[model samples]
Target: GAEGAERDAVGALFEELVREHRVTGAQLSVYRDGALSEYATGLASVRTGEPVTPRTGFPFGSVTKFLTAELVMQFVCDGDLDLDDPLAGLLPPLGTATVRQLLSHTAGVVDSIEYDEMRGPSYRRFAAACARQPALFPPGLAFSYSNTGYCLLGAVIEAASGMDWWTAMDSCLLRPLGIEPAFLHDPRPGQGGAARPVAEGHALRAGGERAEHVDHMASLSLAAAGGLVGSATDLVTAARPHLADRKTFAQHDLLPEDAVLAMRTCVPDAEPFGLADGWGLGLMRHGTGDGAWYGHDGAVGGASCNLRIHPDRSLALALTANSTAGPKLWEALVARLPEAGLDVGHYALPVPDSAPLAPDAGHLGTYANGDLELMVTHDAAGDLFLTRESYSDYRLSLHEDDLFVARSGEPGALPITGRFVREHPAGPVALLQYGGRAMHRL
Candidate 1:
């Protein structure tokens, strides 16, 4: 029943998105009640003239977080790890924080510097650099999305299970889900382009020029953060079961139900500003008034993609593109989802003038999470301001007692709410949690 609708909707959306974006090539996979309805339009490898197909593979960027979460859940099911166990304990000599904190990004761990930020370093060198960086905030004190945190989770998985990351994922989930050609690590040496070759020359003209090659950083160390390549069909297949029923996998069962539930539920108690708009485990929870939609979006060097599942409706959608600029195309497809109704919830909060802000706010200082740092200041008008080292500045207006809303000076200033917490030793530090973790000051 859902399959037909999913197919039609996905196909129509794909066609419109490809034409609008002038995407080089794209693939979409829809699943209803565990059955897949896949559609491919455009090329897989523009250079080789490969056609897009169910078998065509593409980089899934940060979507690999979901798979990493799943593996962690599997360990919890086996009692090898506890969701609440602090990650620092696992690494013993390293530090301590619970697995739950790591999954939800509440651990306050420093994130690995993004590739774009690294001037001229190799991916492996970057990983090493992240490993050496200090924690952003104490574990569990606040939320700051950190790829470094996920990388540590990968290490934790390895330490607890005594298996390499890729093998553990394959034996626990990918193989069980029948995901062929699935790889968390690099493909065999020299077999690079053939694993799931992308079609070339099918550039979606959304921008101006077509995307060049689809090569990404080797997944030697950052395997858990953003290191998975798979066909659109395989991604849908892996996600279909979870969408059918959130409780299908039991915590510490074949799949830890508690962990999955934890992954989906909002961690409302954590520093409000530290958490994303809504996050569960690896999935981002976007509320639609009707229900919660769970999914993950990924972006690597030459590819950007999104895979979403409507759990209540038992529907899943997977879209992949062969260019770093694919998010523009993917967004076009996502806008057509019949279920993706307008966000009617009130995200805006009013600022109170009584909330005294210092004209030369001595408290206005710099705060950071790894390489990401933000400068906090107060304008002459007494509005709290936030400016990232790399991004434009924004004015933050008080919403609630501890919460504030940010009006970005940049293009997409989606009203963001933040909470300021005063630490006895740290003073009034703010956690600006919005749209996945970035930089903030309390």
Candidate 2:
């Protein structure tokens, strides 16, 4: 009844966002109570004057995980695999984690920056490299967002589906679902085809140039964890099944209704992190009660993306931005909905109080999990700082017990909320976690 009102509200919001100008382009799709609203604005390519649209494929970061998870579970639905299948008999070096652990990112798998540094290596080679690394912890004891865990899932997918990586993805997902989003498997620059102008990425760096398309290494190394290339509309199409009742899924003859519910269920021991209250098999569950938020978000260098599923309202949103400002655009969009009489509670968390505790006394240490290195140190003034690549110099404000917050004064940049977990109460500190991945202290 009010689709136009929403279109106008969000349309104005999009125009307002562009007028303020941090991001270059954005595409938003909301499959609401039964209607679908697709909107796009800003330039997709600055040099080419391309516009963000349903046809423009933009990388949706780790949102690719949902697609991969759906494919893996499809195997389970087909009777080709079991959730609790252990890896010891099939692949010895990865320790004894079950398929479910890998799906939920509780597999004790170590996170690595090397995957980002890949040169389009074969999947077999990538999995072998993953097998050589030791587990970050015994299976299921802690929660760390590990892309390698999904890579393992990709390997399992390859084995079970008898389709090579991309082919399997195409056959099972893209081809079967009737969606045609480009699958950019390589992370090297220029892998994005030269034919049509695709949405290019930007870092929002003050004087820096717009970023090139994602390189081959990011796609090849990320595999199932971060490799899809599509638009908000495409994501909505993929997620439409997930938002509807199980009967809708069976009617479509897609993955069974039970498997979708199974994916939505949380692992009993999975920790709360990312954008949700708990971890589901493939998606992160946010808040409690029915119609809570469950979906995935992704970011890698220039591109940032998100998919938010609000089952109760029968709404699911897929948002994509070509600039690093993607996450900020989403946060602002979600934040604005409440004023319009639309509620978005799952993404909100209890804000920290104004009172700041004397800095975490034991917070000093260096934590490493291959490519992920988190070094915590205090200055002469006792101000806490967190160093991880580009945001190396940001300061941390204590939020609660081992949790801390670090933010950027830059426009459209989001604040980082991280936690440090100790082995014993005093802790030589076992893990420094943020953005879902836990890096063990060196």
Candidate 3:
């Protein structure tokens, strides 16, 4: 319930972004000092005229990584897993990489299986592919983001705790945090609300519009990578403990202070692109030096969202938009936070026309990292392409000598640029590094 004029300020900001960006519907929830202060928003379903409410849930594409981080830390707290133990032996047949490496993405694993593309027989096919590929780099060399690494973390959870990935997540993280469990699933044969409504003036890539109609199912294969859905309110509640001082708050201690500090450390510097200036366990660290904020952004068909926490200030913010482009808008809005003024460095612009061969494409091939197989190829015109059996295919063009850009087939698209480098020499290999893991060719 909004009290007096206090509600209008937050409502005005939410309305401005939704209308300006023509977002189908959006939601915002803020928490301070372990208490919920705001849970307000616009629409959640555009076509059916369904208004956004506390119960409205949205898929949190990559934000699930933070949940994975918390779950892993829980295992560490239980003494069931040694953070320094090699992940390969724990997950089996994946190669000996440490649990810490997997959590921090220092593990040299390849993610041939992509999340955006899903269709008939996709997950099974992608997993087979990863089984055939090789690690992108030696464990702990450099920072390369790998969805496959997190997927393997899910496997590690099963192995260490003797429970399925989702069950482990629910018991260890979601349930403990008082959040509901929602998995990625297509609508049942005739289920209503299965297809997510598209925003006006927004275009859907065939199945994108119908994603919500699908039942909630988990990509158990990609579970740890990105596979969870919840309302903005739920997310804030689950993440509040990490933002508060444990000595002061009697809530569950999900992560040790040192581990939390390590998660926020800048493992990747702002180099050629300055994209990695700051990174945390499962979140992206933003701001400079002491003013840095920790959060994670996620994107999947029909859903884009962000969850940020200012630990020192005990402030938490969660924003969700029911559109593919939601995360971009969320990030832009967050950049305007008063705290963001601390970082004044400009992001290095990438060169878009330079077709300097992806330094790491030599290792591009069909490889399976977990339950998906990724086929990395190059077009005759030299553009990079990725195909996963489950989702639609993606074409990547050279954004710069060291980076390539890929986008979903939608207008006003925000291109995600991936950086590549030649790292190993055992075979025709190059590190397809992005999202903090080096996906190598076998």
Candidate 4:
């Protein structure tokens, strides 16, 4: 029944998205009422002309964080660790930051440093490098999505499991769910004597050149953060244990009900601005209300993936795509969910102001996130402009207090929303929250 329903609804949707978005390949998997239906289309690689199949893998990016989160929850359930246990005794300078803070991204950790700085296979080195830099805010003060924080969580996993990071992830989390481990940076094993293929990422170049192949790989040190690769079905299936009333699922025993609750429970002051409404231990609450879904979205170079689980409905939706247009496809798919009789909600931006508010001169400053900086300045015409390397010179219009919308001079470009944060109404701007990262004023 589900298969036939998806054949026309999601299958046709994928067909249109593949063509409209210039996507190289895509997959959609839905698990409902104990049945899993998968829809796939396009080429896994333009260079090889390999058509995508339901089993074809794609890098699922930061969706791996949920898996990492689950692994930590297992340790907590097993009495190997406690949520309130301080990690500074083990990982220095994380002073009094607890396991719960790390899982909820309230650990005061920076988002990430230069990839080159964390080049070793050692998680200790990765932790040291990340912690050496000052945290954006004090622990439990606010929420900043931190890949570095999750990588340190991986280090904690290694210590608890007494094994390597990937080893523990494979043995504890992936294996129990019957999901094989694939990574953005590592090789995949064969399937039934044939080489299992992962969809190659395709990039859109300047001057309207055809989408070209682009490689996105992460270090093994960062694997625990955003390096997993898998099919849409794998993603939905791995999330099964976290679904409400999951006693129907076979792996419910592996992740107990209390453990699932721990992962799903939202933490205080952990609002993930621009990403989701609220932040749980590992999951993000997409929309608030009775039918709010819990899951994560991921993006690498060209591949974009998303997972949403409606616990009350016992339904989960997963999407994987290989192209820069994957995000556009995701937006399209989200809009069409009502066609599938699912009215689950998603995050939406507030309506733009009818008239732009004048840019406050006090907002002008250099805001830094690691080495990346955003220079906010105003011109003689009183238009605020943002300056940065690569892509810069976008006009910033104030939408409301401290919140500004960015629009590039380029035609058909999308606008970005950022807010300047201050300690008080008349205080100096302390941070600029843009592109989902808190950039501290330098």
lDDT of each: 0.64, 0.72, 0.61, 0.79
Best by lDDT: 4
> In model 3, what lDDT does residue 34 have?
45
Our tally of clashes for model 3 stands at 43
Candidate 3 wrong stretches, greater than 4 Å: 1-8, 33-35, 114-131, 186-220, 268-275, 335-442
| TM-score-best of 1 and 2 | 2
User: Candidate 4, clashing residue pairs?
Assistant: none
lDDT for each residue of candidate 4 in 336-440, tens digit (9 for 90 to 100): 767867665778755666678866787788977776778889999877888777674888887666677888877567667867677566788887776557877
Per-residue lDDT tens digits of candidate 1, residues 114-209?
Answer: 544432212334434544656656666666777777877777787888775676777777777777545435533423354445333223334646
lDDT tens digits, residue span 83-109, model 2: 898866544446578889998888889
Clashes of 4: 0
RMSD of candidates 1 onward, in order: 5.4, 4.5, 7.5, 3.2
| TM-score of model 2 (CA atoms) | 0.83
Minimal lDDT window, size 10, model 1 = 340-349
Instruction: Please report how far candidate 2 places residue 177 from its true position, in Å.
Output: 1.5
Order the numbered candidates by TM-score, best leading. 4, 2, 1, 3
